[PDB]
């Protein structure tokens, strides 16, 4: 993949230059944010199953059609598929947050997801609602400073699906 | 518990083929611990006979280090 | 709307790799949309063209996988060297790299210890293929930079030599990814009974099926089109 | 509407068509038709497709 | 980088990062400041390092600039020094990254094929990298010298 | 793959409703026609080789250019693949008739078939003619009612290909 | 679009360099070939209808299935659409020959065509065979050099449809 | 052909052709002249071979042409002899190609299913092929008789 | 694949005719050039590394930006990929020269290679210049008679990319 | 341990440990005293941690001890606290090892089917390890509390 | 030998040797005496071939015998000439055998790593073996010089 440090390295490699003051400033910014990123990553790893539980419960309470007969999440199979997708979203958002770049979200998750959902019949609106549910659930757990950092990656996933 | 050394003989029951297949029928080989249950099941499915299995690399009864 | 389902991956046409020797080339939803989704159900089975004798397809001939090879089939590499000085072993190793990766690797990237074990018979061709397919280089090439189902499709084509039939296989391997990772997917593919019946411990995997688009890439070039 | 965006951002316009539509020689329908039949529209939305 | 390798290791196994990986990321983030100071020191002294390393290499291996050698001539010696500049820049990238990942992906994967194509002897690369190691760690303090020597170590071992 | 019973089960599951009189009426109709379906399927199974032989003979007599050099059925392998395809169409029409639904035809036969033949260069119109040849051959063996029943599936294959 | 002169201008504009000897050689090559290109273009314009007639007759004689019931070119409308496609292929091959570059064939013919034929059910192999027939017919009318030149663009179309 | 087989073998290993298989291609292109002469001899005398073998087979197997037989009638006997003509042409193709590959692709793969569909007895096929082998071998020279019999025996074993 | 012998065999099998004088003359012509083809193939196999050396050196002398920071061949990995692709082209041109046919180029090299490079960002024009460099380098080593034969397959590859 | 994983990762690719692997091992052995005194603090606090963790478990989840629950009865509560002691010992093992491997080869691999055999709710397990996390991190210093809590995070995630 | 390659192929697809392969083996054995004359002629001229090839190599590559070069010094140049003698003997062995398999089994399998361990440039090796080709081909008649040039070219390609 690519993260913030590798991003600076790659741009200066393509330009074929040694590091300047701007590159060191970017690297210092990443080093400043890294400890908060690690705390948030550990928090989310601890509470992954919980976060998925409340986020799915909130989504299925706001949109009860999904779980009821005739809904896309109505089956043990389809419900488990929804929970699996939400777990993937949370894990890769955590990877992107800890990395400081959204490239892993583009490659591993977003490149192909819209077409997959459109072929499967998954409602993309409800999926964006589920991602927003995970965002607001995890914000209370990671803390305001870490919530601000995690929100951009949840927004990235939501915008990629939309 | 890392590596089993297995001697096996798997006769043929679904065809008769004219290529050299002695190496496929009777063979001794090294298998991993995690692979060994699946390997033993697969050999038993093919009607093969397992002659002897020995512990080679790992040590039996290790809680960690396996 | 007015025609049957296309010959297409269940997760979209952008989930079909280009059937070339090596490279893992997929369409992108952003560089140029060019996207067609289709309501391919969970049980839909894809129609695959044999790379070989047409009447050896499993749909007509369940025992066609173990049938005798014709001149239409690819080269088959089998390691009969005593399974305990020989160029056959080196040829088998090169064929294994050509199947698993599509090309030879660079000199620093060779899985040397596995080659030594294969040369001395400690491991079979299937175990050598497992070592190649679970290596960090294979993961770097075909797993970590792709959409998960794209990686699953490509790895399935490299290992079993055919595309997935439908959502049964794709969903099984997606669940295996979700639970156990890249190594779980790769080991599951090699542990299938289909692999063992087609490729034992002896024979390197080869290409058994292609999609109609992959046949179109080869046959429809102006040189290879049948002249009227 | 016709060019999906304002092409004054590039300094591109059909001055005589604009004058004709403003002063009433042509209507907005005839302006739209002459605007979609122009070299600008042909370059933007006919050639690349 | 350290973060990238840890994350890809976690993702290959479909799991969150283990406590050891998170602790390693913490250590890397803490040491980033001395990493950047070392990188600035190497970047500022690039021309002196290249000149002294080239002189030392050609003194140790006179065959390269002798007639018939790969580096005979001002132009080919210039290209040799340019390669040394590439590898110094890659070393600074590796220092700021905390890992040899940028070095590997930019200048180690397929380098043997490249130098076979260019008739460039890999042993000469090895003494060139050792000369850069000596000259650069001559400028740096002991703690900095150890970490920079690790990266020059990796590069020399990869070329060898 | 869904038969009539599975279709009713699904239309009642998606609504979340228990079975009522109408569902029992539909399943009773299927159970009534089941004996005809089983007899026809057994007759076609016993005479499958004869049906394929007769229909291939009729098709290659009406279109002799297929088996002559320059025709798509000119080689031993291509003739074998042609009769193999006729065996597919007959067998899957038997399956669809026994199930009472054409889902297996959209589901295992006609999906991507046009693209496959177009890539292979197989003639589509000639294949439709062969499917008819099988239809007229099979109707005589199965009798009037079973022919009326199997005709919908043969015409389904023909219309999907055409 | 892009033609040979425009292609050289573009490749020297991207790199920011002025024209050098090699660029002038390429421009001179195109300028020399221009007269032959214009003669070929006039010949094809005068004989386009005859070329389409002969190529279509060749294709539908070799593959009568396409115009029999069940074939893709079976109706007056589908047949007319087929000959319209052949007319467009010939005209754009003439355009590319006169331009000296294949850009117009990409942007204006082949960008999106193969997916259009997959959706429509058009046999692309038969279409490529028809394009090859057009190449054979056009070469005889244009002579050896113009035949080689136009065969370049016909083969480009055929390989692009692949 | 031999050239195609060597190229396919070299390609499957992603390597250039080895000197041994280049020597194989050299021997093949050396023998090309006499193999063309053999194929031309078979082509010129095709009607004689077909008539002789058809008569010999029908005498050896009266049941095929008798009423209730597969080849009974003018049209069905014509089809029988036309199949013999296909196989003779295939043997000429194999002779020019230097291997049984054209014969296999054009007239061996799936032959049993074809003739099973056509109610054509395979022992009759084998005896007809053997009759053609005897007739051809009689017509051409002794040295080339073994080469022709190679392809005829391949076809007979494949049909068997 | 399909070589000249197999090409004649196929063009005569599709028609259903025996080999006539023209076919035998084509076979004689192919067999005549066999020694030249084998000699050229052995020479190229012996000197493949040298040919790639000089061709790549000339290509990167004419277009240094490819191997400089910001160029498509700027890394050890991408330079190695460049020389690997050039080796593939040389090997497959040698195969086509041995066979006397360009089929293997279309079904083993050029099948989707243009769009592969376009998706990768590989400059196709620079690849064509590299192929021309390989052709002009190989011609000197093999000799004019073999150079003329290698040229047609090198230009076939070039036109396939272009 | 950290050294074990580093050695296995290096050996898989048939190569010496990279400067990143050496850096992580150096950081691991450098922090040996801190994690060692942390493990000593955890082990000297057997029963306080076990008893408070059990109390919070039962008062947040009353139904484990309620009639019909998994832990109803004195002996089942004793087994519950015994498993708590097991996992505390495993956490100490992982802390000294610098990695969660000992917990994995001892307590994580196969835990789900184990507790499915024992009919032990997994939410109860994660609640218990969370309570033990709270109790243990209360005693330790602020710097060491995070180190303990990360291994407890791994255990809680591993259970459910 | 040709016999060995034919036999291993026949065993690989598991049937008796094909008539064409029997023809090839007869052509090989019938030409054995000419191969023996070629091998003897090369053996008689060991010193001229080896020393002229070494002289040509050191003229093209003065650096190899320059101070710091691989073959600098009398003893290292002697080892150079002895390596050339090894490869000349292997070429004679291959001429006698009828292919290059002896040259592979004794001199090509693992040559790259060995000369890397000895820091011997493979470009120097290919230059030396090309020089041996140039010397040895002149000693022989055209038909024999072609065959010997095949082996020398194959060895040069194997080294490169
Ligand atoms: C048709 C197949 C199908 C099934 C079976 C199914 C199960 C199912 N059980 C649910 C919740 C539930 N299920 C139960 C039942 C439990 N209570 C006790 O613990 C028992 C051990 C156990 C029953 C014997 C309870 C209490 C909830 C509510 C959980 C909550 O609100 O968080 C929900 C969520 C309902 C919603 O979000 O509105 C579903 C979808 N879904 C399906 O599509
Ligand atoms: C890691 C990158 C990646 C992702 C994310 C991915 C998603 C994905 N989700 C799937 C199914 C599904 N996904 C969902 C979830 C959606 N529907 C619910 O209503 C929710 C609103 C919403 C989730 C919040 C559902 C219900 C299915 C079942 C579809 C079906 O069975 O028809 C499937 C196909 C499984 C099958 O049906 O065989 C994939 C491939 N694939 C990938 O390679
Ligand atoms: C090319 C090297 C090679 C050899 C030498 C070889 C021998 C060989 N003979 C076998 C079985 C057999 N071999 C025999 C033959 C014996 N039975 C007696 O009646 C006869 C006196 C005698 C034969 C003259 C039989 C009957 C079997 C069947 C196994 C059984 O059911 O017991 C098998 C195991 C079955 C299999 O092929 O999967 C092998 C490997 N295989 C090889 O690949
Ligand atoms: C049940 C769903 C299904 C269908 C229908 C199907 C058709 C099918 N027919 C094929 C070949 C073929 N099919 C035909 C048949 C045609 N030629 C004659 O003109 C006739 C008009 C006509 C048949 C009546 C022929 C001649 C081939 C050989 C083409 C070739 O080998 O190039 C192939 C490719 C070879 C293979 O792997 O089997 C497929 C996939 N496959 C499926 O999985
Ligand atoms: C190039 C490869 C190829 C072959 C081999 C081939 C065989 C072939 N033989 C046919 C007819 C036939 N072939 C025979 C030959 C049999 N009569 C006796 O039994 C003999 C044992 C035997 C010949 C020695 C007969 C009798 C028929 C007529 C069948 C009928 O009309 O019922 C047909 C049916 C189409 C037609 O008659 O035009 C085919 C396809 N087709 C091919 O494309
Ligand atoms: C960042 C990754 C990267 C590297 C490292 C790289 C190396 C590189 N060095 C080159 C030339 C060269 N490189 C050298 C270096 C050698 N001279 C002595 O032998 C020394 C042992 C040794 C240097 C220490 C020389 C002499 C040349 C000139 C070759 C020639 O003129 O033919 C070239 C050919 C293109 C050019 O000259 O612009 C490349 C691509 N390219 C890359 O994209
Ligand atoms: C056997 C048929 C076949 C070919 C030929 C083929 C080409 C091919 N070249 C690739 C990479 C590449 N290829 C090149 C070479 C080009 N760029 C340079 O500028 C030159 C102008 C030019 C060579 C003369 C480069 C630089 C890359 C690296 C680009 C990348 O991977 O991002 C890749 C990406 C996958 C990989 O690197 O393993 C493919 C698939 N694929 C095939 O299946
Ligand atoms: C070092 C790794 C390891 C572990 C962890 C382990 C657990 C373990 N717990 C057991 C029993 C038990 N364990 C529990 C504990 C549960 N009760 C509540 O629900 C809690 C949520 C939860 C504990 C926090 C209970 C209730 C039993 C008795 C179950 C029975 O009666 O069968 C047993 C069976 C032996 C016995 O009954 O004495 C084992 C082996 N064994 C191991 O080798
Ligand atoms: C039959 C297969 C075989 C081969 C080929 C072989 C070669 C070989 N050459 C060696 C040394 C050597 N070989 C060379 C030759 C090189 N110097 C360069 O200038 C030239 C390009 C090149 C020769 C043309 C030199 C200089 C040494 C001495 C290296 C040293 O001792 O440091 C050695 C180490 C033992 C010794 O020093 O005598 C071996 C094993 N051994 C074998 O068993």
Distance CA A117, CA A109 (A): 12
Q: Shortest CA distance to F86 belongs to which of F145, F151, F138? A: F138
The CA-based diameter of chain J, rounded to the nearest angstrom, is 59
Let me know: does H87 contact H107? Beta carbons within 8 Å: yes
Terminal alpha carbon distance of chain D = 19
Tokens, residue A84:
């699996």
Under DSSP, the state recorded for C226 is: P
How is chain A classified by DSSP, letter by letter? ---HHHHHHHHHHHHT----HHHHHHHHHHHHHHHHHHHHHHHHHHTHHHHHHHHHHHHHHH-TTTTSTTSTT-SHHHHHHHHHHHHHHHHHHHHHHHHT-SHHIIIIIITTHHHHHHHHT--HHHHHHHHHHHHHHHHHHH-HHHHHHHHHHHHHHHHHH-
C20 lines ligand 7 (CB under 6 A): yes
Distance CA G21, CA C224 (A): 38
Distance CA A49, CA J153 (A): 12
Residues 6+ away with beta carbon under 8 Å from G57: none
Q: Which residues lie with the beta carbon below 6 Å from any ligand 2 atom?
A: A 66, 72-73, 78, 81-82, 85-86, 88, 108-109, 113, 116, 120, 122-123, 126-127, 130; C 11, 42, 147-149, 167, 170-171, 174
What torsion, rounded to 10 degrees, do the Cα atoms G93, G94, G98, G104 define?
A: -40
Three-class secondary structure of residue C49 per DSSP: strand
Three-class secondary structure of residue C222 per DSSP: coil
Element spanning C210, H or E = strand C209-210
Distance CA I1, CA G10 (A): 39
Under DSSP, the state recorded for F18 is: P
B16 shares contact with chain K (CB less than 8 Å): no
3-state secondary structure J39-95: HHHHHCCHHHHHHHHHHHHHHHCHHHCCCCCCCCCHHHHHHHHHHHHHHHHHHHHHH
Q: Do chains C and F touch (3 or more CB pairs under 8 A)?
A: yes
Residues 6+ away with beta carbon under 8 Å from A144: none
Distance CA J82, CA J87 (A): 9
Distance CA K149, CA H22 (A): 14
Residue F77 backbone dihedrals phi, psi, to 5 degrees? -70, -40
Residue C203 backbone dihedrals phi, psi, to 5 degrees? -100, 135
H residues 32-51 near K, CB within 8 Å? none
- Residue burial K110-127, b: 16+ Cβ < 10 Å; e: rest: ebbeebeeeebbbbbbbb
Distance CA C158, CA C155 (A): 5
Strand partners, B52: B7
Tokens, residue B31:
């298998």
Distance CA C103, CA C22 (A): 6
What's the residue count for chain F?
162
Q: Which chains touch D (3 or more CB pairs under 8 A)?
A: G
3-state secondary structure chain B: CCEEEEEEECCCCCCCCCCCCHHHHEEEEEEEHHHHHHHHHHHHHCCCEEEEEEECCCCCCCCCCC
Q: Shortest CA distance to C134 belongs to which of C191, C175, C90? A: C191
Tokens, residue J148:
């303990």
Distance CA E63, CA A78 (A): 71
Nearest alpha carbon, ligand 4 atom 33: C49
Distance CA E148, CA E146 (A): 6
Residue C210 backbone dihedrals phi, psi, to 5 degrees? -135, 160
Please, which experimental method was used? cryo-EM
Q: Shortest CA distance to A85 belongs to which of A42, A45, A55, A40? A: A55
H124 lines ligand 5 (CB under 6 A): yes
- How far away, in angstroms, is J118 Cα from ligand 8 center? 7
What torsion, rounded to 10 degrees, do the Cα atoms K128, K132, K135, K141 define?
A: -150
Q: Shortest CA distance to K102 belongs to which of K88, K113, K114, K115? A: K88
Tokens, residue F110:
């006609």
Tokens, residue A68:
């009821």
Q: How far is CA C186 from CA B41, C159, C182, F149, in A?
A: 19, 8, 6, 47
- How far away, in angstroms, is F126 Cα from ligand 4 center? 12
What torsion, rounded to 10 degrees, do the Cα atoms B22, B24, B29, B33 define?
A: -160
Angle among Cα J140, J142, J146 to the nearest 5 degrees reads: 85
Let me know: does J87 contact J155? Beta carbons within 8 Å: yes
How is chain G classified by DSSP, letter by letter? ---HHHHHHHHHHHTTPPP-HHHHHHHHHHHHHHHHHHHHHHHHHHTHHHHHHHHHHHHHHH-GGGGSTTSTT-SHHHHHHHHHHHHHHHHHHHHHHHHTSSHHHIIIIITTHHHHHHHHT--HHHHHHHHHHHHHHHHHHH-HHHHHHHHHHHHHHHHHH-
Nearest alpha carbon, ligand 5 atom 18: H71
Distance CA J55, CA J59 (A): 6
- How far away, in angstroms, is J56 Cα from ligand 8 center? 18
- How far away, in angstroms, is E86 Cα from ligand 6 center? 10
Beta-carbon count within 10 A of I10 CB:
17
Distance from CA of F83 to the nearest CA of C (A): 10
**Which residues of J touch chain A, with CB atoms under 8 Å apart?**
126, 149-150, 153-154, 156-157, 160
- Residue burial G125-150, b: 16+ Cβ < 10 Å; e: rest: bbbbbbbbbbbbbbbebbeeebbebb
Let me know: does F75 contact H106? Beta carbons within 8 Å: yes
Let me know: does H105 contact H149? Beta carbons within 8 Å: no
**Which residues of I touch chain G, with CB atoms under 8 Å apart?**
65, 110-111, 125, 159-160, 162
Distance from CA of E71 to the nearest CA of A (A): 23
Q: Please, how many CA atoms are within 13 Å of residue G139, restricted to the half-sphere of its CB?
A: 17
Three-class secondary structure of residue C207 per DSSP: coil
3-state secondary structure K39-100: HHHHHHCHHHHHHHHHHHHHHHCHHHHCCCCCCCCHHHHHHHHHHHHHHHHHHHHHHHHCCC
Q: Which ligand is nearest to the CA of J93?
A: 8
What torsion, rounded to 10 degrees, do the Cα atoms J43, J48, J52, J57 define?
A: 40
Distance CA B54, CA B40 (A): 13
Q: Shortest CA distance to C70 belongs to which of C51, C97, C50, C52? A: C52
Distance CA I62, CA I67 (A): 11
Q: Which ligand is nearest to the CA of K12?
A: 3
Distance CA C106, CA C126 (A): 22
Let me know: does F110 contact C86? Beta carbons within 8 Å: no
Tokens, residue A160:
């990629």
Alpha helices in C3-147 (DSSP H): 87-100, 112-120, 125-133, 136-142
Distance CA H39, CA H28 (A): 15
Q: Shortest CA distance to A85 belongs to which of C167, C148, C39? A: C148
Distance CA H120, CA H80 (A): 9
Under DSSP, the state recorded for E75 is: H
- Residue burial F97-112, b: 16+ Cβ < 10 Å; e: rest: bbbbbbbbbbbbbbbb
Q: Shortest CA distance to C4 belongs to which of F103, I63, J136, H154? A: F103
Q: Shortest CA distance to C158 belongs to which of C174, C142, C171? A: C142
Nearest to G152 among I111, I125, I159 (CB): I159
Residue C78 backbone dihedrals phi, psi, to 5 degrees? -120, 140
Let me know: does C209 contact C161? Beta carbons within 8 Å: yes
Beta-carbon count within 10 A of K26 CB:
10
Q: Shortest CA distance to E148 belongs to which of E7, E50, E39? A: E39
Beta-carbon count within 10 A of K9 CB:
15
Distance from CA of F25 to the nearest CA of G (A): 39
Let me know: does F8 contact F26? Beta carbons within 8 Å: yes
Distance CA A69, CA F102 (A): 25
Distance from CA of K124 to the nearest CA of E (A): 10
What torsion, rounded to 10 degrees, do the Cα atoms K1, K4, K6, K10 define?
A: -170
How is chain H classified by DSSP, letter by letter? -HHHHHHHHHHHTTSPPPHHHHHHHHHHHHHHHHHHHHHHHHHHTHHHHHHHHHHHHHHH-HHHHSTTSTT-SHHHHHHHHHHHHHHHHHHHHHHHHTSSHHHHHHHTTTHHHHHHHTT--HHHHHHHHHHHHHHHHHHS-HHHHHHHHHHHHHHHHHH-
Burial of J98 per CB tally in 10 Å (0-12, 13-18, 19+): buried
């Amino acid at each position: 993949m690519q993260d913030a440090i590798t991003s600076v390295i790659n741009t200066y490699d393509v330009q074929g230059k040694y590091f300047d003051t701007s590159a060191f400033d970017k690297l210092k910014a990443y080093y400043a944010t890294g400890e908060l990123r690690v705390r948030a990553a550990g928090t989310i790893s601890a509470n992954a199953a919980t976060i998925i539980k409340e986020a799915s419960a909130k989504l299925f309470s706001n949109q009860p059609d999904l779980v009821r007969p005739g809904g896309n999440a109505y089956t043990t199979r389809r419900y488990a598929a929804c929970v699996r997708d939400m777990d993937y979203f949370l894990r890769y958002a955590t990877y992107a947050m800890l990395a400081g770049d959204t490239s892993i979200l583009d490659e591993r998750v977003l490149n192909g997801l819209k077409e997959t959902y459109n072929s499967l019949g998954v409602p993309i609106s409800s999926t964006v609602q589920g991602i927003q549910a995970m965002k607001e659930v995890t914000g209370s757990l990671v803390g305001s400073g870490a919530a601000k950092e995690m929100g951009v990656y949840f927004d990235y996933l939501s915008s990629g699906l939309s | 518990t890392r590596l089993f050394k297995v001697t096996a003989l798997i006769p043929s029951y679904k065809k008769v083929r004219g290529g050299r297949e002695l190496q496929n029928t009777y063979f001794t080989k090294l298998v991993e611990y995690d692979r060994w249950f699946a390997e033993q099941q697969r050999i038993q499915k093919q009607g093969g006979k397992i002659l002897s299995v020995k512990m080679v690399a790992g040590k039996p009864g290790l809680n960690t280090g396996v | 709307y007015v025609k049957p389902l296309p010959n297409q991956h269940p997760y979209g046409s952008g989930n079909d790799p280009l059937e070339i020797q090596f490279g893992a080339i997929f369409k992108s939803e952003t560089k140029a949309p060019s996207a067609r989704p289709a309501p391919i159900g969970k049980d839909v089975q894809r129609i695959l063209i044999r790379s070989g004798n047409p009447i050896t397809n499993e749909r007509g001939n369940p025992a066609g996988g173990i049938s005798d090879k014709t001149s239409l089939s690819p080269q088959i590499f089998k390691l009969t060297q005593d399974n305990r000085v020989e160029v056959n072993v080196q040829a088998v190793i090169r064929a294994a790299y050509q199947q698993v990766f599509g090309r030879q690797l660079y000199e620093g990237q060779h899985l040397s210890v596995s080659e030594i074990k294969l040369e001395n018979g400690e491991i079979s061709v299937k175990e050598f293929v497992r070592d190649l397919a679970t290596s960090e280089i294979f993961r770097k090439l075909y797993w970590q930079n792709f959409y998960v189902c794209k990686s699953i499709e490509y790895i399935h084509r490299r290992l079993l030599g055919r595309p997935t039939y439908g959502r049964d296989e794709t969903n099984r391997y997606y669940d295996l990814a979700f639970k156990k990772g890249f190594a779980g997917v790769v080991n599951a593919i090699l542990d299938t009974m289909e692999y063992a019946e087609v490729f034992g411990d002896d024979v390197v995997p080869y290409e058994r099926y292609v999609t109609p688009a992959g046949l179109n890439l080869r046959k429809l070039r102006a040189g290879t089109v049948p002249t009227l | 509407q016709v060019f999906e965006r304002d092409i004054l951002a590039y300094g591109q316009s059909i001055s005589y068509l604009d004058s004709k539509v403003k002063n009433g020689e042509i209507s907005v329908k005839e302006f739209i038709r002459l605007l979609g039949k122009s070299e600008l529209y042909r370059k933007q939305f006919f050639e690349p497709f | 980088s350290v973060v990238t390798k840890a994350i890809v290791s976690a993702d290959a196994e479909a799991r969150y990062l283990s406590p050891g990986e998170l602790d390693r990321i913490r250590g890397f983030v803490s040491s980033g400041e001395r990493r950047l100071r070392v990188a600035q020191t190497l970047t500022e002294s690039r021309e002196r390092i290249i000149k002294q390393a080239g002189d030392q290499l050609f003194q140790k291996r006179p065959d390269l600039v002798s007639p018939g050698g790969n580096a005979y001539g001002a132009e080919r010696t210039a290209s040799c020094l340019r390669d040394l500049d590439y590898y110094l820049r890659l070393v600074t990238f590796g220092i700021v990254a905390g890992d040899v990942t940028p070095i590997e992906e930019i200048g180690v994967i397929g380098v043997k094929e490249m130098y076979r194509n260019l008739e460039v002897p890999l042993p000469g690369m090895v003494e060139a990298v050792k000369a850069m190691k000596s000259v650069a760690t001559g400028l740096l303090s002991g703690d900095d010298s150890a970490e920079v020597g690790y990266y020059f170590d990796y590069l020399a071992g990869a070329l060898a």
